[PDB]
Design a protein around this ligand. Structure first.
Ligand SMILES: [Mg+2]
Ligand code: NI
Ligand code: NI
Ligand code: NI
Lengths: 168, 168, 168
């Protein structure tokens, strides 16, 4: 990278050709989106402060908002539930964020984690992988079962499929 | 119905001609919206998983989201407050869902129910009719008064008028 | 004012030429927005019931909603965090509303107030100036320090820049 490239990246999201982006969604600024991910209706992914990196096969559902003081990193195979706010945090692979949840700056969610709807995770909170987290403030309920890790897998898989239909 | 009609239904919402749908809203997939209902700014009504049925005189306020693993049924004279998430549940007639509430799959709300702002009702939760429900998790506070039922009517009634002003 | 002006004001927001309004935002009805403020992606500012007044240098972040039974007043130098609902309340100058908060009708927030993410303030609730409010229901945590008030100023200031960059 160089001066002109940094300017380009500040203005033009690097969105993989394979990514479904609903017309009503706004993907603004410095945003890298990986293979087969999907951005749903009225979502806002704005990398104008901290940049945003979204992995592969990850879904950002309707009206969800991604923004951040520091960088926001969302892994591969992640499901971001409807109207969730992922703000400057770090989300490992195979995480399902329950609809309406808010995860604030510098929080870290470990791999194969399930987050209940409407969960509020304040800044700098770390969580071990393989757990169920719920509530406000979000706390660990129990370790995840193989059946739970599966549910996580079916969710992102479903979205891979629905994503095709919304333009094929 | 037949194969061709089922295919039409997965792509074209059945929206009664009287319904007001803000331009910024997204009504997508298998969705049926009845007479004199209204869909407000940036709402998202997505019936691409469980189909969605919305009754008559029912208002879905700004940035609300209707989606579901299972079928979502919203009755008549229902007021879905700003930014609510109604997901795979059953909402009876004359219900006012407080703004920012989240009602999950298979949950069931009885007729003439008033729900406080910011309420979180998890899946399969059921409630009797004629109550004030409130909080996270949502619980019944008391039974509804005539005064409360009137307020519920005035609410949807106001939206019938406002919707017409958004057409004329 | 007169009949024709009242009718114009009910249909056409008074937006200062200086204000950045994202294309995906809806600014509807009787809304007045002051110098150097900014309305972000997919926000809805609807003054079709109570009118809305937004001061100078104030930012209404993504998917935030402004609406109200009664009048809604937002002062100057205010930061309205992502997905907040500011509903028929009175917000003083230099206030930062944490993302995902809900402030209901007739609530009154004083100058130099910091509100944590996900806070739910019900109607008629009142707070003094110089405090940190948080939770559901929102309560005062401690008075604000100079370091805190600075944070408030830097927040709206950052948005002034950002708004400019979303135009040049
Ligand atoms: Mg939109
Ligand atoms: Ni932000
Ligand atoms: Ni859903
Ligand atoms: Ni309202």
């Amino acid at each position: 990278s160089n001066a002109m490239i940094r300017d380009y990246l500040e203005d033009k999201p690097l969105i993989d050709e394979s990514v479904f982006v609903a017309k009503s969604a706004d993907v603004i600024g410095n945003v890298k989106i990986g293979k087969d991910s999907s951005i749903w209706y009225n979502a806002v992914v704005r990398g104008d402060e901290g940049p945003i990196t979204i992995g592969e096969n990850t879904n950002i559902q309707d009206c969800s908002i991604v923004h951040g003081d520091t960088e926001t990193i969302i892994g591969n195979n992640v499901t971001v539930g409807h109207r969730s706010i992922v703000h400057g945090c770090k989300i490992s692979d195979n995480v399902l964020i329950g609809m309406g949840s808010i995860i604030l700056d510098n929080a870290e969610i470990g791999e194969y984690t399930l987050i209940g709807a409407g969960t509020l995770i304040t800044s700098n909170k770390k969580f071990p992988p393989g757990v169920l987290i719920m509530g406000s403030p979000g706390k660990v309920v129990r370790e995840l079962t193989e059946e739970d890790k599966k549910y996580i897998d079916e969710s992102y898989e479903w979205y891979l499929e629905a994503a095709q239909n919304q333009k094929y």
